[PDB]
Symmetry: C5
């Protein structure tokens, strides 16, 4: 139960660290149109980032951004990759 | 669907419900490999998906919207156009 | 004569909508090194975005970002693609 | 071109001249397909182009800088490294 | 020098801007490791250390406005290089 946001917050905080997480999956040959499968990778990336924020003893993560790639092998999409990153903060 | 969305933050009091994401895509016909205006549809669809998620979380709108885009190639031709939209769902006060 | 910016503005406004535009061109075989040809696509993307801002009855666009792709056909760059997007606002 | 540039905004009074963009690129030799440190010079070139455009618009500097990057492949090898830089040219007060 | 702050967003505090800085880091995948996108973790760390060292050479206190670009570079129809670019604005407080 730890907060996450794309932008900053108007409140007093100190900065613990910037954290990053990558998650990925492999597509079946028949599923090369299934870009909806990115949904689970964003949620996995967030949970990895939140766990890292909790290990740093922060209250949450500001400044979240995502990078995405669709990686091709032998002229077909084969991997979907999300990178998430943000700044872990502690309020006051 | 009457719910606000913005690329940046807002100077107002809010609480943060959650960050939400949506992906939309389409498959190009062989003759339409030059039709990058077809991304318009996908940005619209991504926003609708995001707004629906904001409404299920019982927020007033979405701040901090960004889009990632890909043109995915199959056997040396563009075949899919993909938009990912994401942002922070907030509740005012 | 309508303003556009990458960041927000410290002033009172209401939000009309987020708008997006895509611009693209096809490279000749001999022009696969000509990445300066993105310049005109950025300008076209802005003009499309401004047009949309004016249709929504806003004063300008905050939060502008651009995505870019170089799309390959048969192992050569063939299309240059810009996506522009931002938030249309009305001052006060 | 002793002229300021930043990724974020500034807490100060300004007016907005325009948004500006610059692209810079280079071609890799076959033996240099692992040399991604060669992006270094392209970022610098992109900044120089953006600053020169800011100076033509008679601004004091550039806020909101972002970069897009691509590694463009020809016949299944990286051949071009491409940087796009863009930002908002401002004038203080 | 070692312990220097870095953040994705700005800070609500008084500062002057030294310069914008950039770093790139990369690695080459083995054929058997074309699924190993976890290996980006290293590259983000390396990119940050390069950026911090540039901030320290400019005599700043830290880096605001950090962003990362990423690419997965293919050679002969397989992923061969993972590339991170990091960039941000080096500042000095007061």
């Amino acid at each position: 139960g730890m907060f996450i946001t794309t932008e900053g917050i108007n409140a007093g905080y100190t900065i613990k660290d910037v954290v990053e997480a990558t998650s990925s999956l492999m597509l079946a040959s028949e599923d090369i149109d299934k870009y909806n499968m990115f949904d689970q990778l964003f949620d996995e990336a967030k949970q990895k980032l939140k766990k890292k924020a909790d290990l740093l003893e922060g209250d949450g993560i500001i400044g979240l951004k995502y990078n995405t790639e669709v990686v091709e092998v032998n002229g077909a999409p084969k991997f979907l990759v999300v990178h998430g990153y943000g700044t872990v903060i502690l309020i006051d």
